Structures are given as structure tokens and as C-alpha cells.
Design a binder for this molecule. Structure first.
Ligand SMILES: Nc1ncnc2c1ncn2[C@@H]1O[C@H](COP(=O)(O)OP(=O)(O)O)[C@@H](O)[C@H]1O
Ligand SMILES: Nc1ncnc2c1ncn2[C@@H]1O[C@H](COP(=O)(O)OP(=O)(O)O)[C@@H](O)[C@H]1O
Ligand SMILES: Nc1ncnc2c1ncn2[C@@H]1O[C@H](COP(=O)(O)OP(=O)(O)O)[C@@H](O)[C@H]1O
Ligand SMILES: [Mg+2]
Ligand SMILES: [Mg+2]
Ligand SMILES: [Mg+2]
Lengths: 375, 57, 52, 57, 375, 375
């Protein structure tokens, strides 16, 4: 722990938890949001026999544990799970006590207000944090980009959000949430791999196939033409070496997986591709600034490490929108940490401690005070 | 040794990205200036033609 | 025109500099430290415990 | 892992360096074009003003 | 079909289509303006496999169809959709052939003139109606009220129009259209219910929540005081039984949803509440008759079935305008049919057939003749 | 600031504010009279968060601000708005302190005397101007023309005034104000464009359509014949490139918009066209000089940059008045600055400082002194 009473910066992103100290450039403890529970009961002795397993421990013990998600698309299952994982993060991973450091947290866009009130109340009772602040990840990604104008595409693991912000002003009237995310990607890839001869249901193979998505997946420039040329495609077809050692070969599926977000009719969504959701979002607001939105679009999330989103994005928007002004996307490398960086940015300046949510305000007005203290 | 080398390479990324972004800022400045100059020139030419017509009449 | 350009680029550079400040504060103390496995050759063969 | 990262960073080195040099070339092109445009704008202003004085006469 | 050659009376209201015969008191075929399309492709056989689904058929088949709106705020998407729905209305629902009956139609206020010219041309070519007349729904609601003086507030599902008419004379200079309507109401309620923990995007839940608006919604007498007392409000809080069987409880939202029309700043409109739009409309015209406008205001539309518009209306106008003369609103029960009733009224008198738009006039002067034949 | 104590010259024209120093040929700081205010509340930090936005700043920030008019047709809303905009003009735009320079101001014709008394009092208390003079813009435009005989048509953005002045003598008995101005032009064009399929309400599109009026609009030589030939008119129909990039095509509307001032019956005014208002004005005064008024008519205002006013003016007056004497209009290019030029002319001569309204006169007789000091 630093000698100074600097604040805690924790991004509880929908899919990854990244925690650390204020003034740091990158979060120190970063782990996926999976939680493992003993698949069977206790009869043995001498070691183990522990209920909750979180972090890399559960990653190593994936096979023996039922792998469960305490949060999915924002919905909260069991607050005890968050209690334990935050205990682990603060003491076993961050080696910090929350008594002496206020916490800045980031929440998924348009999270329930009742969810905020319950989570804040359990937090304040269970923990002894001196002060509090929670913010939407959209403005955090904006801060990471450091440009007040643009539309943020937050692609988490449970929801994809499109949020327009002009000159550092939120536009909730033109903000939308789409239920397509990593979960859907894994599902669709699971069914295609089932049609390829490999049919698995458990979560270990879920992580294997999301790793495959991280490594080999394409974003098709032209879809049906690329499957037409991918009929044989000995060179274009790509293989992976699974940890057991078998060589699993995939061809068109590499670019037929992320395409589903762009083409939701593959597995039955009324909503069109996410580019249509950015398009409608843009026109909902006044006409004039729309060009700037076209030229200032930002994309954020862990998924963004994949190739192909930028070219597809620009080409389709230019197809939909007039091609007079030039559209260009901006995306700094390793932007999944960017939100946490913005949290540090919030703690940089000396005005941030004017609106810390202190203990006594919550003791006076209950959780309801946040309704007036954040917004 | 390898990881240290990778870190200095990462610093290379950072500073070269800074060079690219300052260049891009100057690109926007000078391209906007070019639009303004061409628009003013066209307007002045149209005004010159109109005043020549007025002079003839 | 120069004033418009200066104002825009100055706002951009102000946000850029505030972003640099966080990196200026710390740059290495965020990574974890080294604990690789090596040596241990001198340890004995008959462990004081029976997991030998 | 370290070796592949270093090689990726080398690929990035060359890509971004080239981008920056290209931007500098564009800068020079834009500069000379802007100078020519400013010259033409001053020419047009002078012409229009002279025509206006003749018109007033 | 009646033995007599009486005319067809059809109100294509922005949100509902109500069609029937002249001389009838109520329209016979009344259906919402939603249109359903097959969400997927055809592989099965033996039944169904039909493209367009309209009326109660689509209402029953809402889940399987992409639900699309052929008209929104007056804008026309696809004339083929109107072709099919009019075919359905005339033959499957009205059991009438348009060959032997002239048609009186009502159009949304200030509808495009190009829209009128194209719709009339496609109509005349596709159909064989002997004669035509189209009128603004404002004067139709006036006729239903049967009083030549008043300002009509037409609250459709796409637009809300304020139109003043003094002694049976239109005042286009003081007529305005506001982009707030049922769509906005559903949207705003959707986001509030999202903040209540229930987040849906599809149209079935859109119809469910508009039904909730029909049943439970309030118009708050005092807004912030009623949320202040609605903090707990066990008695004031009201519940609904959704068709799946879950009990969904809503409190202040009941009167926080229609309030948005009155307070547009909630979701960002420069225009103030609709009472301000009636106020400005009134003062635009000569001072003297304004008092009569105050005392003769009429409201029309399906939304008017909700409670609370009358009291709010009068109180705010009295707050804005001097309280010497007494302001009173008039609104007959089941006034959403009233426009169609007025259509029947138009066919009641024997002068109406002096200005039927016959086939030969259109054949001579093209669609352009309507520019001289209606106005 | 110049080393000399020369006076300030400020034209607060109804639609544009043009300010500068005496002895200068053109005003230095010229901005439209629109004022922008934050459309929403403050939650963000680090930049902006400023209430009043004036000048080009508000022009760039039009989309984010509610755009309001501190003056409309002469009526004053909030003196604080004038306080702020004058502060901005003097210090941020003119870089001058009013302590050391007397101010010459121009006011809209027939402005309220109570308005003058309140504005002068707030001015003198708030500011520290050494001396004062305010004049009607009519004689200023006369001075710009430099001919003591003529009738001035001042077409501002809120009012159009017709004022006859013979041999440098005002004729208030034959002076009239008409409520038609730029606002009406934009409104009428808005409704016609609504009938063309494009329906906008916000002020950004107001500025776009007034720009369209500046660029493409005609003044029809013959009205109904030109719409008759404008039925198709592929060549005569003209298009505009809106900043978003869409091509918007307009035909007869180009000359059907300014025609409304000439033909007020289009949107319901008892008063006939402005040429009738100049005609009546002329006959109200003695018969003999009327011919000179016919031959010495002057037109002034920013609108005058449009084509077609001169030909229409002369032809209609010749139609109304006998065609013996030749009628010719005079209008110097860039005459919207002309008023300010006349202000400089007032400061040119050494008799002007005989009737500066000094501080001590106002301190003695209050604001009432202006009732005896200007007129
Ligand atoms: N290094 C990486 N390369 C590619 N994809 C990644 C990487 N790390 C994480 N992801 C993907 O990002 C997802 C998590 O998204 P996350 O960054 O938590 O969203 P948010 O930005 O809302 O927190 C995971 O499902 C995973 O598939
Ligand atoms: N029985 C009812 N009770 C309450 N609201 C209704 C009822 N029927 C229809 N509505 C509302 O009226 C709207 C349709 O308005 P509509 O009557 O078509 O406007 P118009 O008068 O312009 O035709 C629908 O969105 C629906 O929410
Ligand atoms: N360059 C221009 N070309 C055409 N019209 C203009 C131009 N500049 C201003 N206008 C019009 O002039 C109007 C303002 O009139 P203004 O000159 O302020 O009247 P006044 O002479 O009473 O001050 C604006 O509504 C605008 O439409
Ligand atoms: Mg994300
Ligand atoms: Mg209605
Ligand atoms: Mg004027």
C-alpha cells in the first residue's frame, strides 16, 4: 500500500474486473468475471475443500468447478458472489484495505437504478470505504480517447451499447443496448462447430472457443463471396492447436462468427446489425452534428482486439450515409484497460474530491442520496 | 532481457503514435485552411464577374 | 482562422496533457514482480514429511 | 511470446513510420497549395476592388 | 353489401384504420396500423407460408413476425403495404368492392402534397373507385363535436397537431405539428421500465406497455410532490398482471410517462409542453377571439381515453391566460371513432356528391387536378 | 485601443450587432443577435460549463444550445442578455473599455420610449460610458446615402419600416411599421418545405433555410405564370447542397417565399404588400413632393442583398402611380454596414460633441433628461 491515501480505481466491466490504485497507468489485478463452485461434495481431507474459487485459481480449476456467472448482461444473481470476489481482489490480489481509500467504480451503461441502490447499500454496510463515486463506462472510454465529441460503441461480454456524446454531453435519448455480445458469439460458434463434428457444452470448451475467436477469427469483407471462395481455400483455411494436442481446422467460420452481430437474422433478432444501431442512433439527434458523429465514432471493449471491425464499420456507414465527408475510426491499442485509465484520470484532478460520496451522506439519506449525488 | 526489449519497443510505439497524431492534427489544420481559401477565392471571382456585368450595363 | 485552429488544438492538447499526467505519475509499479522457479537443488531427498 | 511480440512491434514500427513520413509529404503539398490559393485570393480581392472603384466613378 | 350505392367511409388515422359504409354510426372494420412479416424463410409446407399479415391475424401472430409500420408520423414507407392492407380491409374485412362505392378518406394534418399526389395516383390506377374525396381529420373532429368554433388537439400515434378553427374556418397560420405521440410515450416508458429492471426491445412488449398506459397510467396533478409522496405509496402504487402471469408493479411512472409530453425537457425537446403549443397557437391569431378559443378547445384521438388530460389542460391554460373567463374542455366518449362518424356526416347531405373526384377528371388532368379540386 | 479618445459606434440592428470605433470605415465586431443557452444541466467537468454563449461561439455550438432571441420586433426580453452580449462585444470582441469612449448607438424605428428610458438607465448604472447619443436607423441610412430627400425602407429581421424624409426632415405622420421580416420569411419557407417533405422545427434548420434564402431565392417577375412554367422547369429549378451532404431541390418556392411580403394574403395579413405601404405613406404627405419621393426611394437592410427587390419595386410603383416621371431606386453594395458607416460620419464632425449625453446630466435629471436631450 502506498503511503498516501490515494483512491481505489476499479472497473467492474461486464466480462472483466480490473482494479488498482489511483495515479497508476494500468490496473494491477485484472481477472475474468467467471466464478467456480465445487461440482461435488466433501469426503476427502488434507487440502482444498473451499467453496468459492475466483480468478486464476478458478481458471486452473475450471474442470472441477461448475463455472457460473454472477453477472450476465447486467443482471445480478447473488450479491454474496460479488462480496467474495471483491474481498479477494482487495486483500489477496490488490493487498489493500478499503478503509483508507475511496473507491471510483465504473458500471455498465443503463444499469438498473434499483441495482445501484442495493449494491451501494450492501457495499456500504459490508465494507468500510470512506467515500464513493460510480460512473458510466461510456464517459470513461471518452476520457481515454480524450475527445468530447463522438459515439461510443461499448462491446462488453453481456451487452453492446451505442451512446452518442457531443462536446462532452450525454445523449440518453439516442442511447441503445443490444443483447448481442461475447456470449452470443460463443453460442453461434458452438453450433457451427457442432455442425463441423465437434459438440461440447461445458464452459472449458467455451473458453477454448473464445480463445479461438481471439486468435484466428476474421471479419469478412464480402460474406457470400468469401464462403464461395472458401469452399476449398487450402491457404485461406486456418487451423488451431488445442491444448490437448489435436489440430482443429476452421475455414469460413472464422469470418462467419462475428458476422452474426452484423447479420442478426442468422439466429433470429428483429434488430439489424450494430451498424444500423449506430445509424439510427445518429439520426435520432439533430441533423447538423451527425457528420461529426460520423467522423468521431469510437469503439471500446475487449472484443475490439479482433481485426476487421474498423474496415467493416467505415464501409457500411459510408454505404448508408452520404460519402462526402470522410469517416475515420479511432481505437488506441489495449483499450480494454482504457476505462480504468480514465478512472485514474478522474482521480488526477483536485476537483474530484468535491463530490466523493462520503459515509455520513449515506447514513443521513440512505441509498436514496445517490439519486441526487451522482445525477 | 527479452521482456525489457519488448518494453522499450512499446515506448517506441507510444512516441511514434505521438508523432503520427501531431502530424494528423496539423493535417486537419492545413486542410481546413485550404477549404477556407478556396471558398473565399470562388466567392471573390463570382463577385468580380457580377461587378463587371454591372459596369457594362 | 488561426484563432479557431488554436482553440481547437489547444483543447485537444489540454486533454492530451491531462492524459499524460497519469502516465507521468507511475509507469512500472503497476506490474507484478518476479518469482520464477529455479535452483532448489540443495534441498534434501528424504523430506521431513512422508509426502516423500 | 516475447519474440512474437517484438516482431509484431517491428511490423508496427515500419507501418507507423511510413504513415508519418507520408503525412509530412502531404504537409508540404498542402502548404504550397495553400500559398497559391492565398495568392489567388489576394489577386481576386485587388481585381474586384479596382472594378468597384471604376464602377463608382 | 347494401343494395344502395352509398359511399365508403375510411379513416386512415395515424395509428388506426377504421373503415365502413356511409350512413353507419360506427366503422365496421377497425384495426391498428401494424404490419407483420415472416421473420424467417420457408422450408415447411401444409399451412401458412404467407408474406403479408395484417389486422388481428398479425396481432395473434406478433411473435413470429417482424412488426413494421408502413406509416410513421405521416411518412410513407412502401405503397405496396397500403395496397395489401386496403385489399384486406375492402374484401376480407368489409366484404365490399370499391367499384360501386365512392370513397371518403381522412388524412393526417399537413400531410405532404407529393404524398397526396402519389397516393391518389397509385390508388386510381390500382383500384376502380368511382369517385373520391379526402379531408383533414381536424374538420372531421370538428364535425363530430358539431361546433364551428374551437381549437382541435389531434393526438395520433405519430404526431400531435394543434389546429385553430373559428366559425368553421381553418387557420393554417396558427397550426403546428409536434413529433410527440404514442411512439415517444412507449419509448420513454421503455427506458423507465429498463431502470425498473425490465429491459425489452421487441414490439410485443411495446403493445404490452401501451396497454399498461391504457389501463393504469395517471396524469399527475403536481409532479414532484407526487413522486415525493410516491416514495413508498403502498396504496398509490399500482400493479398489472402481464399475460404470462407475472405481477409487475409500477408507482410514480404511471404519471411520469404522459408527463413527458407536458415536460419535453425530460428527453430533450426544444419545444415546451403541448399546452404551450396551444397557447402560442392561440395568440398568433387576433386577440379578441382568443377567449372563445380558450372556452371552445376540443381534444381528439385514441390517447384521449386516458384520464387526466382535461384537468391538466384547463389548470395550465388558466395559469398561462387570465382567469376571468371560464375555460372548459369538451370530449365525447369514444371520440377515436368520431372522425369516421364525421365522414358519415359528410355523406349524409345531398350536396356532397357535387364535388366527388370522379375518374374522368383524374384522367383529364392527372393527379394535379386534386390541387384544384380539394383546395 | 487607439491612443485617441475617439467614440464608440455601435449599431444594434434588429438582427445584427455591428460595433467598432469612430473614424473607421466598417464595424469591427459584427455578429447575429442569436443567444445560446445550455440545453441541459451540469454533471461533467474539465471544460465548458458556461451559461451564456454569444457570437460565433454560439454559432458553432448551435446544436447543444437552446437558441433564444433577446429581442424580437423590438420587444426586449431580458436586459441581462444585452448586458452579457455588450460585455462580450466590448471586451472579448472589440477589446475596448467603455470608460474612455462615448457611445453612439442606433435604435429600431419607433422603439418604445419606456424601452429607451429603462435601457439607458441600466446602461448608465451598469457601464461607465462617459457620454451617449442614440439615433434612429432611418437617418443613419439616409446619411449613408448622403441625400436629404427620400423614403427609407428599413427591412430588419423583426420589423420592416417605411419612413419618408424630405430635405433631411423626418415625417412621423407618414411612418409605418410592418410585422413582416426575416422571421416570417423563414416561417413561410418552413411550411412550404414541410409541404415538400422536409419538416424541421429547430433553429439550426432555421439558419440553414435563411442561408438558402440568401443564396438561391428569386423575386418572381410574374407570379402565377412563373409557377405555371415552373411546373417542370428542369433548368429553372435550383438545388442546394446542405452541409450534411444531401441535395435538396427547390423550384417555384425560390420566388414564392419573398412574394409573401408583397402578397400578405398568403398567410393572412390585412395589410397589403409593402409597396402599398410605401404608396399610402407617400400620399399621406402633400401631393407636390410625392414625385420626388417616387424618384428618391431608398432601401436598406441585410435582406437587400437578395435580387429582385429593385425591379419589383419600380414596376409596381409605376403601376400604382402615374408613369410620367421616371422612378429609380438607389442601393449601395453592402448597405447593411451603411448605418454603422453613418455613425462614423456622425463622429466625423466637430459639432457632434456639443450634444453628447454626459453622465452628470443623467445624474441630475435621471433618465427623463433624454426626453429633452435627444428630441
Ligand atoms: N486480449 C484479448 N484479445 C481479444 N479479445 C479479448 C481479449 N481480452 C478479452 N477479450 C474479450 O473481451 C470480452 C470481455 O469484454 P470486456 O472488456 O470485459 O467489456 P467491457 O469493456 O464492457 O468491460 C471477453 O469475452 C473476451 O472474449
Ligand atoms: N381504448 C383505448 N384506450 C386508450 N388508448 C387507446 C385506445 N385505443 C387506442 N388507443 C391509443 O390511441 C393510439 C392511436 O391513435 P389514433 O386514434 O389512431 O389517432 P388518430 O385520431 O390520429 O387516428 C394508439 O397508440 C393507442 O395507444
Ligand atoms: N450577406 C447576406 N446576404 C443576404 N442576406 C443577409 C446577409 N446578411 C444578413 N442577411 C439577412 O439580414 C437579416 C438581418 O437584418 P439586419 O441587417 O440586422 O436589419 P437592420 O438593417 O434593421 O439591422 C438576417 O435575417 C439575414 O437573413
Ligand atoms: Mg466493453
Ligand atoms: Mg388522433
Ligand atoms: Mg434593417
Amino acid at each position: 500500500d502506498e503511503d498516501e491515501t490515494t483512491a481505489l480505481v476499479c472497473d467492474n466491466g461486464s466480462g472483466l474486473v480490473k482494479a488498482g490504485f489511483a495515479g497508476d497507468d494500468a490496473p494491477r489485478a485484472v481477472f475474468p468475471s467467471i466464478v467456480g463452485r465445487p461440482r461435488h461434495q466433501g469426503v476427502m481431507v488434507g487440502m482444498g475443500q473451499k467453496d468459492s474459487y475466483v480468478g486464476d485459481e478458478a481458471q486452473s480449476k475450471r474442470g472441477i468447478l461448475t463455472l457460473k456467472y454472477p453477472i450476465e448482461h447486467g443482471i445480478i444473481t447473488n450479491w454474496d458472489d460479488m462480496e467474495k470476489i471483491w474481498h479477494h481482489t482487495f486483500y489477496n490480489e490488490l493487498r489493500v484495505a478499503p478503509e483508507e481509500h475511496p473507491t471510483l467504480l465504473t458500471e455498465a451503461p443503463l444499469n438498473p437504478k434499483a441495482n445501484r441502490e442495493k449494491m451501494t447499500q450492501i457495499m456500504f454496510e459490508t465494507f468500510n470505504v470512506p467515500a464513493m463515486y460510480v460512473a458510466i463506462q461510456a464517459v470513461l472510454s471518452l476520457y481515454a480517447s480524450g475527445r468530447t465529441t463522438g459515439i461510443v460503441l461499448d462491446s462488453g461480454d453481456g451487452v453492446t451499447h451505442n451512446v452518442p456524446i457531443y462536446e462532452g454531453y450525454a445523449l440518453p435519448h439516442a442511447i441503445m443496448r443490444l443483447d448481442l455480445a461475447g456470449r452470443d458469439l460463443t453460442d453461434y460458434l458452438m453450433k457451427i462447430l457442432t455442425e463441423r463434428g465437434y459438440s461440447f457444452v461445458t464452459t472449458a470448451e467455451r473458453e477454448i472457443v473464445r480463445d479461438i475467436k481471439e486468435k484466428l477469427c476474421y471479419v469478412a469483407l464480402d460474406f457470400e463471396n468469401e464462403m464461395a471462395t472458401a469452399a476449398s481455400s487450402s491457404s485461406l483455411e486456418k487451423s488451431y492447436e488445442l491444448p490437448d494436442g489435436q489440430v482443429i481446422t476452421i475455414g469460413n467460420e472464422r469470418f462467419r462468427c462475428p458476422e452474426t452481430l452484423f447479420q442478426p437474422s442468422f439466429i433470429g433478432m428483429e434488430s439489424a446489425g450494430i451498424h444500423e444501431t449506430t445509424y439510427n442512433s445518429i439520426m435520432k439527434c439533430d441533423i447538423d452534428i451527425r457528420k461529426d458523429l460520423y467522423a468521431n465514432n469510437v469503439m471500446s471493449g475487449g472484443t475490439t482486439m479482433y481485426p476487421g471491425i474498423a474496415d467493416r464499420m467505415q464501409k457500411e456507414i459510408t454505404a448508408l450515409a452520404p460519402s462526402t465527408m470522410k469517416i475515420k475510426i479511432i481505437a488506441p491499442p489495449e483499450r480494454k484497460y482504457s476505462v480504468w485509465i480514465g478512472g485514474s484520470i478522474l482521480a488526477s484532478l483536485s476537483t474530484f474530491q468535491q463530490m466523493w460520496i462520503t459515509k455520513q451522506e449515506y447514513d443521513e439519506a440512505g441509498p436514496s442520496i445517490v439519486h441526487r449525488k451522482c445525477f | 532481457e527479452a521482456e525489457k526489449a519488448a518494453d522499450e519497443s512499446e515506448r517506441g510505439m507510444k512516441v511514434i503514435e505521438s508523432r503520427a497524431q501531431k502530424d494528423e492534427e496539423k493535417m486537419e489544420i492545413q486542410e481546413i485552411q485550404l477549404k477556407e481559401a478556396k471558398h473565399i477565392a470562388e466567392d471573390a471571382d463570382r463577385k468580380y464577374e457580377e461587378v463587371a456585368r454591372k459596369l457594362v450595363i | 482562422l488561426g484563432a479557431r485552429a488554436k482553440e481547437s488544438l489547444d483543447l485537444r492538447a489540454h486533454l492530451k496533457q491531462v492524459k499524460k499526467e497519469d502516465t507521468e505519475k507511475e509507469n512500472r509499479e503497476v506490474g507484478d514482480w518476479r518469482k520464477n522457479i529455479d535452483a532448489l537443488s540443495g534441498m534434501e531427498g528424504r523430506k521431513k514429511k512422508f509426502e516423500s
